[PDB]
Structures are given as C-alpha cells and as structure tokens.
Enzyme design. Structure first.
Site, PDB file in Angstrom:
ATOM      1  N   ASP A 176       0.870  -1.164   0.000  1.00  0.00           N
ATOM      2  CA  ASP A 176       0.000   0.000   0.000  1.00  0.00           C
ATOM      3  C   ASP A 176       0.922   1.233   0.000  1.00  0.00           C
ATOM      4  OD1 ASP A 176      -2.586   1.428   0.289  1.00  0.00           O
ATOM      5  OD2 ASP A 176      -1.688   1.970   2.294  1.00  0.00           O
TER       6      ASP A 176
ATOM      7  N   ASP B  64       1.026   5.140   0.560  1.00  0.00           N
ATOM      8  CA  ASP B  64       0.270   6.217   1.182  1.00  0.00           C
ATOM      9  C   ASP B  64       1.127   7.466   1.060  1.00  0.00           C
ATOM     10  OD1 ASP B  64      -1.344   4.140   1.744  1.00  0.00           O
ATOM     11  OD2 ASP B  64      -1.087   4.235   3.923  1.00  0.00           O
TER      12      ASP B  64
ATOM     13  N   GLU C  58       1.495  11.188   0.853  1.00  0.00           N
ATOM     14  CA  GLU C  58       0.655  12.326   1.214  1.00  0.00           C
ATOM     15  C   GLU C  58       1.436  13.616   1.001  1.00  0.00           C
ATOM     16  OE1 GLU C  58      -1.319  11.617   5.061  1.00  0.00           O
ATOM     17  OE2 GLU C  58      -1.485   9.464   4.564  1.00  0.00           O
TER      18      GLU C  58
ATOM     19  N   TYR D 144     -11.956  11.528   5.106  1.00  0.00           N
ATOM     20  CA  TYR D 144     -11.970  11.964   6.516  1.00  0.00           C
ATOM     21  C   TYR D 144     -10.955  13.092   6.623  1.00  0.00           C
ATOM     22  CZ  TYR D 144      -8.629   8.017   6.219  1.00  0.00           C
ATOM     23  OH  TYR D 144      -7.619   7.186   5.811  1.00  0.00           O
TER      24      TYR D 144
END
Ligand SMILES: CC(=O)N[C@H]1[C@H](O[C@H]2[C@H](O)[C@H]3N=C(C)S[C@H]3O[C@@H]2CO)O[C@H](CO)[C@@H](O[C@@H]2O[C@H](CO)[C@@H](O)[C@H](O)[C@H]2NC(C)=O)[C@@H]1O
Ligand SMILES: CC(=O)N[C@@H]1[C@@H](O)[C@H](O[C@@H]2O[C@H](CO)[C@@H](O)[C@H](O)[C@H]2NC(C)=O)[C@@H](CO)O[C@H]1O
EC number: 3.2.1.14
Length: 538
Positions: free
Chosen positions: A288, A290, A292, A367
C-alpha cells in the site's frame, strides 16, 4: 541385534530461515535471510550398540546421515522449509534401525509456517461477520499502538476484515529526505539508526523492537525467532489465510521520500527494496502506497512538484510489474493499493484513470475534511454529503468519489474511508440557528492521545452523557456532539453514518469501506462497516 535406542540431547530446538539478530539496531544487521535454517541435533546412547549409521529424521524423512562413531554424536544440517517437525535420531545397522522418541523442533519462516494460529476471541462490542459480500472491509493497525494505546495484533477483530494494513513502513533517508519525522521526538533519530549502513530510498522498519522483538501473545518464549507485531501477524495469517495483510509505506510523517522519486535511480532502488521486503516478510500480501500527497500540501511545506502526478503513475506501474514478477515466482496473488487524498484539488493532480490500471484498490481518505488545524472554518470531518447550511461545502466523500469517477476511475476500485476517531474544537462561539459549525473556535478539543482528536471508543464512552448534546445530521450523514458551556464540538463517524456510507457504496457499485485506525474503535464502527456492506452475521 539392531542398535540401542538413542536419547536426544537437551539443547536449542528453535531455528530460523530468516534470522533476527537479537543485539543489532540497524535493519541490515538485524535481518539475515538464508536459503535454509542451520539446525543442530546431538544425542547420547546409554544402552547397547551405537549402530553404524546415525540419521536425523523430520516426520520420518532423513535430513542428515553419517557414520555412527561413538556413544554421543552431533548433526549439523540445513532445513529449507518452515514448520514444526517431529524430529528423531535413528541409529541403524545391517540388522535394522532404532529411532529415538520424537522431539518437536521449530524451523521458523516469515510466512508463519512454524506458528500455531492466532485465533483470538472478539473483544469489546465486536460481533462476528462472514466476509461474503465480496466488498473490501479494511482497517489500519499502527506499529506504535502497542505502547500507550496497548493495542496488539491479538486484539484485532481479524475475522471482520478482508484487508489489514500495517502503518507504517518507512523509507530510509536523513536530512532533506525525512525532515517531517523531526516534528516527533526521537522519530527521525530512530529511523537513522534503523537505516544505518543502508541506502537512502530503501524501505526499512521504523521500530524493530515493536515489529520483531516485543513479547506478545503467542510469541512470548525467549527463543521464538519472531515476536512483536510481525510474529503475531504471521500467526494471524495462519488463522486467517485469506486475510490480505498489506504493509503501508508512507503516511503523514513518512511521505517526504516519495517527492524525490522522479529520479528513476531512486525509484528503481525503492521498488527493488519493496520486492526484497516482500521476499523477506512472507506474511505480507502486496504493498500500500500512502503518499501524502503528490503536489505537496502534506506535512512538509517545502515539497511538492508539478511532476508528482507523472511520478505517481510511473511508480504504480513499476510496482505492479515488480508484483507480477513476484507473483510468477511464488504463485501468490499480490495486491497494489494506495491511500489518497479525498480533496478534489489533490485528486486532480494525478491521472487516476491511468494509474488504476496498475492498482487493485484506491483507499479514498474521506476523513480529516475539517478539524482543529483550522479554527475558523468548521465542518463535518468525514461526512458523506454537504450539510443543509452549506450545500457548496468543498470537502465531502461524494465530492472525492465524483472527482475520481469524472476522471474515468472504475467505481469498483474505489474504497470509501470511515474514521474510527473524531476531530474537535474547544471554545466554539458565534454560531447561528443552533448549528455550532457556523461559528469559530479558540483551540483544539482535549484529545485522547493528541490535541484535537478523540478515539471513537472515548466519544462513545465519555461524551454521550451529562451536558453533551448529540445530533445526527441526516443531510450530510454525520453525527456530532456538542457541550455548549465550554464550546467543545466533536465531529466523527458512528454506526449510522457508516451505514449511510455502506449503502452508498452498494448503490454506486464502489469497492467497499476501510478505516483509520483499528485500535480506536469499540466494535461499533467495524460492525457497521460489515453489516452495511451486506456481510452476514455469524
Ligand atoms: C489522529 C491520528 O491518528 N494521527 C496519526 C497520523 O494519522 C493519519 C495518517 O498518517 C494518514 N494516513 C492514513 C493511511 S489515514 C490518515 O489519517 C490519519 C489520521 O489523520 O499518522 C501519523 C503518522 O503518519 C501519526 O503519528 C504518530 O504519532 C504518535 C504520537 O501521537 C507517535 O508516537 C508515532 O511515532 C507517530 N508515527 C509516525 C510514523 O510518525 C498520528 O498519530
Ligand atoms: C480536505 C482537505 O484537504 N483537508 C486537509 C487535511 O487532509 C489535512 O489534514 C491531514 O489529512 C490527511 C488525510 O488526507 C492525514 O493523513 C493527516 O494526518 C492530516 N494532518 C494533520 C496534521 O492532521 C490538513 C493539514 O493540516 O489540511 C486540510 O485542509
């Protein structure tokens, strides 16, 4: 006569194919991958003829033999397959073979083939679901959660997930490469120590103690080759062979190195380090990413480039070609996923309609839309829709999903995010019409572990009595609690807003739901994820 019956000598009985050095802090020295475990067995014969050949048998099958030359002997040999084996020493001559009683030995490997399954009862409010909807049900487990949060792998309600993501695997690099780590005391230094002697842009383990060495249920014996989160995840895989356990690389504080990967030298090094990591830690089922975020606006205000979209697509394509080589070598299915911003402004920095061709799932981070990081513009942090008082609200789940769909992302790739935590403010004041979100705040709410953030467990436990108002906004699909005397306002997901997200997932033929972070739920959130996606109870 056949030989006397030998007695196996007392001695170590646990050996490892991938060895963890117990006094090393650098990842390169900590982990030694061998082609086979080096096993040793000794024996004595207290009665009779010692025979002419001595053999070591593992479940009856010879692993070593040599001449039997005296009353005591030692065999050193290699075993290339993990497991627990009934080992015997047999002494043989022309008149037959006489085998010792069996002693179990452990030959550890990182698929957990040597481990009893970790099958633990559900805790708190978690209820059992079958994974029969064919939808993703994911959550993140955090490496550092074993300390203060006291949440260990044996506490994961693993039967209730299809995907369990491990936050986070770091990428090696010092100054200018992992500067965002420096905001957390000791964190940047722990990474430099783990990465000592190791090239920048290769993956490592951020806290090797928590990952490999901390005693935990099932892996508490001093001689267990793997302990910590990884040893328990191996045992968990034995209990749940269809659970997909993905290492997540990046996150808020470990994303800086991605911004350098437009250099294919670094990107190749990174990808090759991932392949090696999956060959080393066999319990993981893919990777995965991620990051950011492509384009910047992550933790580091000095990173972000127009080139990032192109780098993201090249990275996903090369990780896929690496996984397809690994899948060919092993016969296993590996997944490639990524957690992404749900903001349209960040989404349109990347061609996800091109990258999706490399990816199994997109974890949409629907979120953190609002929170104590902005005291002036308040809103629901994880809502499905905009609220009635501001229908043009930029950051909602539906806006992020529609951004992807408008690019041409297939709906089935998109996994909608739910929060197992609330964000909140204190001192909210100056609001109209009994809607606290229309006001402004003077600070963050007091948090469970950090300011401005509260575990869902604590919201449910502590903030549903006394002065706290509770309201479910059915337009936005979003609960909130409010204490007017202090102006404390908390925005979160609950069973009902999760139900609304699941319903929406089913309606729009999206891929499923995932959550951050599993330690913060009391069961309510994950129960609702499962039920709303149509998983059967039991
Ligand atoms: C509120 C919260 O849980 N914050 C943690 C933050 O979580 C964010 C993720 O990084 C994003 N990635 C996802 C995947 S979901 C998404 O949202 C969550 C919540 O906004 O993650 C930080 C690491 O990136 C966490 O930092 C950790 O903080 C604790 C102390 O509070 C510290 O002990 C840990 O060392 C630190 N871990 C790291 C790797 O920096 C933050 O808790
Ligand atoms: C809609 C939007 O872009 N909101 C921004 C937030 O995303 C962002 O907070 C960060 O969100 C990430 C998930 O997208 C998390 O990984 C991360 O932990 C979180 N960072 C912090 C410090 O909470 C903030 C940045 O402060 O800006 C918003 O505009």
């Amino acid at each position: 006569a056949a030989p006397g019956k030998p007695t196996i000598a007392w001695g170590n009985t646990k050996f490892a194919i991938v060895e963890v050095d117990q006094a090393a802090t650098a990842y390169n020295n900590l982990v030694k991958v061998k082609n086979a475990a080096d096993v040793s067995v000794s024996w004595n014969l207290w009665n009779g003829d010692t025979g002419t050949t001595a053999k070591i048998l593992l479940n009856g099958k010879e692993a070593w033999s040599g001449p039997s030359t005296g009353s005591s002997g030692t065999a050193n040999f290699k075993v290339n397959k993990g497991g627990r084996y009934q080992m015997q020493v047999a002494l043989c001559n022309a008149d037959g073979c006489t085998a010792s009683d069996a002693t179990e030995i452990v030959v550890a490997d990182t698929d957990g083939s040597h481990l009893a399954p970790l099958k633990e009862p559900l805790l708190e409010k978690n209820k059992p679901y079958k994974q029969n909807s064919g939808k993703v049900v994911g959550s993140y487990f955090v490496e550092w959660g074993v300390y203060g949060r006291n949440f260990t792998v044996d506490k994961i309600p693993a039967q209730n997930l299809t995907h369990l993501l491990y936050g986070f695997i770091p990428i090696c690099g010092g100054n200018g490469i992992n500067d965002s780590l420096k905001e957390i005391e000791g964190s940047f230094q722990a990474l430099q120590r783990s990465c000592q002697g190791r090239e920048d842009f290769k993956v490592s383990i951020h806290d090797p103690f928590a990952a490999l060495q901390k005693a935990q249920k099932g892996v508490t014996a001093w001689d267990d080759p793997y302990k910590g989160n990884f040893g328990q995840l191996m045992a968990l895989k034995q209990a749940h062979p269809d659970l997909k356990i993905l290492p997540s690389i990046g996150g808020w504080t470990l994303s800086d190195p991605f911004f350098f990967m437009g250099d294919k030298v670094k990107r190749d090094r990174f990808v090759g380090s991932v392949k090696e990591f999956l060959q080393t830690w066999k319990f993981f089922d893919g990777v995965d990413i991620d990051w950011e975020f492509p384009g910047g606006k992550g933790a580091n205000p000095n990173l972000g480039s127009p080139q990032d979209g192109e780098t993201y697509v090249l990275l996903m394509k090369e990780l896929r070609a690496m996984l397809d080589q690994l899948s060919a070598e092993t016969g296993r299915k590996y997944e490639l996923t990524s957690a992404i911003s749900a903001g349209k402004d960040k989404i349109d920095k990347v061609a996800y309609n091109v990258a999706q061709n490399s990816m199994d799932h997109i974890f949409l981070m629907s979120y953190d839309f609002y929170g104590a990081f902005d005291l002036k513009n308040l809103g629901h942090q994880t809502a499905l829709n905009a609220p009635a008082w501001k229908p043009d609200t930029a950051y909602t789940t539906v806006n992020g999903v529609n951004a992807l769909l408008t690019q041409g992302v297939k709906p089935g790739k998109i996994v909608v995010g739910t929060a197992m935590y609330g964000r909140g403010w204190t001192g909210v004041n100056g609001y109209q019409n009994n809607i606290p979100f229309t006001g402004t705040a003077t600070g963050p709410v007091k948090g469970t572990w950090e300011n401005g953030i509260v575990d869902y467990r604590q919201i449910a436990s502590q903030f549903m009595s006394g002065e706290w108002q509770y309201t479910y906004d059915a337009t936005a699909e979003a609960p909130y609690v409010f204490k007017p005397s202090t102006g404390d306002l908390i925005t979160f997901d609950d069973a009902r807003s999760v139900q609304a997200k699941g319903k929406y997932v089913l309606d729009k033929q999206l891929g499923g739901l995932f959550s951050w972070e599993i330690d913060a739920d009391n069961g309510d959130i994950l129960n609702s994820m499962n039920a709303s996606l149509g998983n059967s109870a039991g």
